[PDB]
Structure formats: C-alpha cells, structure tokens
C-alpha cells in the first residue's frame, strides 16, 4: 500500500513536469527560433558553388 498509494501523486507529477518542460521548450523556442531560422535560411540562401576537388585539370 505504500507503493500503491504513491501512484496518483506520481501520475500528476509526471504531467506537471511534462507541462513545465514543454513550457520551457516553448519559451526557448519563442526566444531562439528567429535566430536559428535566420541562420539556416542564410546557409540555404548562400550557395557557394564548388567543383569536386578531385577534378584534375
């Protein structure tokens, strides 16, 4: 019964900690997504054309 009586408390706690972690993710996401996207988009949009370096001539 000491283990069994802990289950509902643990069930609520894992949801609380999931909601907190997902909130932390959403906060980090909203704080960082702009800079991250701008970096990726800039690398997409900066082509830097190169030949393969093994080309002899």
């Amino acid at each position: 019964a000491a283990a069994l009586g802990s289950h509902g408390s643990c069930s609520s706690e894992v949801e609380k900690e999931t909601q907190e972690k997902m909130t932390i993710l959403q906060n980090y996401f909203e704080q960082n997504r702009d800079e991250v996207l701008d970096n990726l988009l800039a690398f997409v949009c900066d082509i830097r054309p190169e030949i393969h370096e093994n080309y002899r001539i």
């Binding site: 393969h52 370096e53 093994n54 080309y55 002899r56």
Partner: protein
C-alpha cells in the same frame, strides 16, 4: 609527382599514375592521409593495402608516395616514448590532439621536431676527415643514464664537409654534411631505416656472457646469454609479468625495448600504466626505468599491419641501440598475437593457408626475426660491441606446443622459461617449471663460469640431478610411502625440497629477494649442495655399520644447519656488504663441516 585513387574494395585501394612506385613502398591515401603499403604493381597502376579504415576514401583522391618502404625514424627522443607498431608516438598523438583516440589519418612525425637536445660533436673529427656507416660523429645527452650516440647511417660514407659545433640542436638542424663521388649528402640527428631489413654488422659474434636477471631459478638453472633468444609461455594463470618486470627493473642490459604485439586492451594499459612507476638503482640514485626504454604498444584493435610490424619496429629500434654499443634487451608480449596478424594479412592477400591457418612463411618470418639477436661488433670505427636479447613470449592453446607459432618458436629459441599455472596456484614464484624448462647456452657460458665461478657448473649439474631424483622418488613415495625409501633417497628428497622452496622460489616483493645477485645465488646453492654431499657422505659412509646415519639424526643433531640453509635467502646486498654475505656463507660451510664431523 603523386598518384590518384582508382578503386577501393574493403581495405585494398587501387591507384593510378603510380608508375614510379615500388612494391612495399609506403603510401599516403586520401585527403585524410591514411597509411598503406603497396602490395602489387600492374604497370602504371598499383594496389595499396590501406591500414586504417578506408571508409570515405574517394576515386580521384590524392595518393602521395613516401620515398621509403615501411620504416622507423631513429634518433633522440626515443627514450620514454610510446609508439605503435608503425612508429607513431602515442604519447604525442594524445597530448597534441587533446583526444582519447588515435584520429584516422595521423601525420605526427615520429621523433618530435623543435625539441632541442644537447649535442656534443665527436671532438676527434675535422672537416676533410674520412667517415663510414656506424661512425659515432657525436653524442646527444638526452637522459642522464643513456648517452645517445649519434651515428652515420649504414648506407652513407664519404668525407666530412661540415660538422656542427657543440650546442643545442633538433631533427630540423643539418648536424652533418659529407661528400662522396662529388655529391653532398645532408644529415640530421634523425636517421631512417627500412623496418624489414636487418641493420648490418662488422661481425656477429658467439654469445658468451649471462643476461643476469637477479632471479635464482633463471640465472642458475636456465641461464640466458646476453644476445640470446628465449621464449616464455605468456598466459594469465602463470604470472608472465614476473620475468618481464624483473628483466627491466634490474637485469644487466643497458636499454630495454618492449613490444606489444597485439595485447588485450586492458592488459596493454596495465603495462603502459605500470612500467613508468618502476625504478632501478644507478650510481646510488633511484630513477624511473623510462630513462632506459621505449614501448611499442599495440592493442588488438590497432591495424593488422601495425600488429605484424610491431616486432619488426621493436627489433629495429633494438638494433639501433645495439649499434650504439649497448646490451639491449627486447620483450615481445605475445608472438602468438603477432602470428595472428600474419594470418590476417595473408588472408587479405588471399595467400594459401599452410599449417593450421598460418602463412607458409610463418616459420621463416619467426626465424629471420630471431636471427636479428646476438652480440656483434658494430659498424664504424670506435670498435664497440653491443647486443640484442630477444624475449619472445608465446601463448599455446591449452599449453599444446604443437601450435605452429609455439612449435616454430621452440624450434628457433635457445631458452624456454616454462612458467606453469600449477606452480602459480601453489604460489611457487617465480613459478618456472624446471622439468619443462631448458637452456642451450650452458656450453656457451662455460668460458665465463670457468673464469668467475669455477665450481658453479658442478653445482648446477648436481642441483638439476637432485631435483630430477626427487621427481622420480615421488612415484615411489606414492606407491609405498616416504617411510619405504632408502636413507640416501630420503635425504635427497629433503634437500631437493630445500632447493625447491628456498633456492628456486624467490619472493620479489621482499627487500632480500626483490633482486638476487649472482654471487649470492652461487653461495646459497654451494651451501645446499655442500650440505647434500656431506650429509650423503655420512649416510653412505655408515652403510653396513652398527649405527647408521639418517636425515632424522642430521635434523636432530644439526637441524640448525637446515634452518640456516633456509635462512640464507634473507641476506641483503644493501644492508650487508658482499664480503659480509660471503663470510656468513663461508661460516655456514665451517659450521656444517664441524656439525657433520660430530656424526662422521
């Protein structure tokens, strides 16, 4: 100049524009500079066995030819270095990369540049002097114990055009320039040698002096000569470390090399951790053995070529130190794991299996390796002798000597120190089985012993006979009990037990047995055998008498001599002078003679 990759299949890389290559020429492959050896030419195409994993090599990648076959850089900075089997410095590949791995595509120079050393040019030389391979044109003081003698490479010769003055120099400095046939050769303290080629000598000599290990059983009953070839059955249950540590931390050998053929990863790190902590006494100072060695360590996962090269790098380093006039000694931790690297490279080469799986050449590779040992007159002019002693461990499956590497090794080596798990389970350290073990160098040490220890050959002969007689008598003891044996047999068994327990056995952790000098060893055995002959005299002299002497009467009236004989091991070469030890042993001879006279 350089070629280009044409194809790859597993570790085998085909290249093109290789027209100027040679078979077994060393090559760098790929943008990451992977190491490999050419194993076929096909015209302007060549096939390279790559060592490291070829994953990510591309067609059209560069293939730089190295101007040399597989080779060892030789010079200052060897001492205390740890190399792998293809001569890459594992201590520096650590400290320079700050990584726990060997990165695929290492290019670190084997003897580290920019490190200056104190170089003394040989003050006897002048510009215009004649010079030849093996001439000591200078010395590098790289460590207090080992003056590194520089020498002209064996292929080089000519007249000195310039020599550096005394000072601090490194591998990039042109220490020497010489001319021959109108052509100048520039030279450095670093020298290079093909690893599979013997370094030549003025004359290979007959070996005639003991490689004193400070270990009674070895040094007395199975002496290995300096320059001798020997094997140890290296297996976990028998304590192979005992011999290899004792050889390094005491034995009469100026420089040690140790080759990890292909050891288990942890057991290799055990050695590399532990050896730096060993110390030996020199000039009344205590110093780390890393002043007198270099370790060529390969774990089982190092490339197949690095395992099969391991012993050839080791011997090449050892021959370079031999040509400085040192009595080098080289361990190989498992010639069996080197023989597996042979099986694997022959498997990749698709060569036919000979004995049990091994290549046809396994016996010839072993034999042409072991022949690199011996005492020699060096090349060049200062006339010095040197040697390489080879201590090649073997690991026969279940102890079965019919195993091809073990069988060929016992065919070639002149000494076998047969360690035994039974003796180790009984804690009979050094645990060498004296019945199985042998040395073919007995004859060759007659000259030495006749000069320095003229009684010792009689003593050794008697000792082996006494122990052999006890092994035969033990069958009678099992059949009919100790009570049934003759008095001569009973005293022989008691003395053989004394020899076994208080002479063969030696506790190398104790201050008195951590090492054991040869004079100590002789004096201990001399007393035990002098006691045997006088005890046996009293027994046999009282054959057919009314009162007959027996071992029990000897133990009753003079068991103090038996107690003293067992006690003779405690004498200490540090706290007791050599003369004091000899005097105590001479006193025990007088004591026992007077005690025997009280009976007969």
């Amino acid at each position: 100049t350089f070629g280009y990759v044409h194809g790859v299949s597993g570790p085998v890389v085909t290249a093109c524009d290789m027209a100027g290559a040679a078979m077994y020429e060393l090559v760098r492959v790929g943008h990451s500079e992977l190491v490999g050896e050419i194993i076929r030419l096909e015209g302007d195409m060549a096939t390279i066995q790559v060592y490291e994993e070829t994953s990510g090599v591309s067609v059209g990648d560069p293939v730089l030819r190295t101007g040399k076959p597989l080779s060892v850089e030789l010079g200052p900075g060897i001492m205390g270095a740890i190399f792998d089997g293809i001569q890459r410095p594992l201590s520096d590949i650590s400290s320079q990369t700050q990584s726990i791995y060997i990165p695929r595509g290492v290019n670190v120079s084997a003897l580290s540049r920019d490190i200056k050393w104190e170089f003394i040019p040989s003050k006897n030389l002048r510009v215009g002097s004649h010079i030849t391979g093996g001439d000591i044109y200078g010395i590098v003081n790289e460590n207090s114990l080992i003056k590194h003698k520089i020498m002209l490479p064996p292929r080089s010769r000519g007249s000195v055009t310039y020599i550096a003055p005394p000072g601090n120099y490194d591998a990039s400095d042109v220490v020497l320039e010489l001319e021959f046939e109108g052509v100048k050769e520039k030279l450095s303290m670093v020298q290079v040698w093909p690893v599979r080629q013997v370094r030549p000598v003025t004359e290979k000599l007959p070996a005639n002096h003991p490689l004193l290990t400070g270990q009674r059983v070895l040094d007395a009953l199975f002496p290995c000569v300096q320059g001798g070839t020997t094997a140890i059955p290296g297996a976990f249950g028998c304590g192979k470390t005992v011999i290899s540590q004792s050889l390094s931390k005491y034995s009469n050998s100026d420089v040690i090399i140790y080759v990890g053929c292909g050891e288990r990863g942890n057991e290799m790190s055990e050695v590399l951790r532990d050896f730096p902590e060993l110390t030996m006494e020199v000039d009344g100072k205590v110093e780390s053995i890393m002043k007198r060695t270099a370790l060529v360590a390969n774990t089982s996962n190092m490339p197949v070529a690095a395992r099969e090269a391991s012993i050839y790098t080791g011997i090449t380093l050892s021959e370079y130190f031999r040509d400085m006039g040192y009595h080098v000694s080289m361990m190989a931790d498992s010639t069996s794991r080197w023989a597996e690297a042979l099986r694997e490279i022959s498997g990749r080469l698709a060569e036919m299996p000979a004995d049990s799986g091994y290549p046809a050449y396994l016996g010839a590779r072993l034999a042409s390796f072991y022949e690199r040992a011996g005492r020699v007159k060096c090349l060049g002019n200062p006339e010095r002798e040197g040697s390489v002693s080879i201590v090649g461990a073997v690991s026969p499956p279940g102890g079965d000597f019919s195993d091809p590497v073990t069988s060929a090794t016992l065919g070639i080596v002149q000494v076998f120190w047969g360690l035994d798990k039974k003796l180790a389970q009984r804690k009979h350290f050094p645990s060498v089985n004296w019945l199985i073990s042998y040395s073919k160098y007995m004859r060759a040490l007659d000259e030495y012993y006749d000069k320095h220890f003229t009684e010792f050959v009689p003593l050794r002969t008697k000792a082996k006979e006494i122990l052999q007689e006890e092994e035969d008598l033990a069958e009678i003891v099992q059949l009919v009990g100790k009570a049934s044996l003759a008095e001569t047999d009973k005293i022989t068994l008691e003395v053989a037990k004394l020899i076994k327990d208080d002479f063969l056995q030696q506790n190398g952790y104790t201050p008195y047995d951590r090492f054991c000098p040869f004079y100590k060893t002789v004096g201990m055995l001399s007393n035990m055998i002098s006691f045997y002959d006088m005890a046996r005299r009293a027994v046999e002299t009282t054959a057919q008498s009314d009162n007959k002497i027996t071992w029990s009467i000897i133990r009753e009236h003079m068991g103090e001599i038996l107690y003293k004989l067992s006690s003779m091991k405690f004498k200490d070469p540090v706290k007791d002078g050599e003369a004091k030890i000899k005097a105590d042993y001479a006193q025990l001879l007088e004591d026992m003679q007077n005690a025997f006279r009280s009976l007969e």
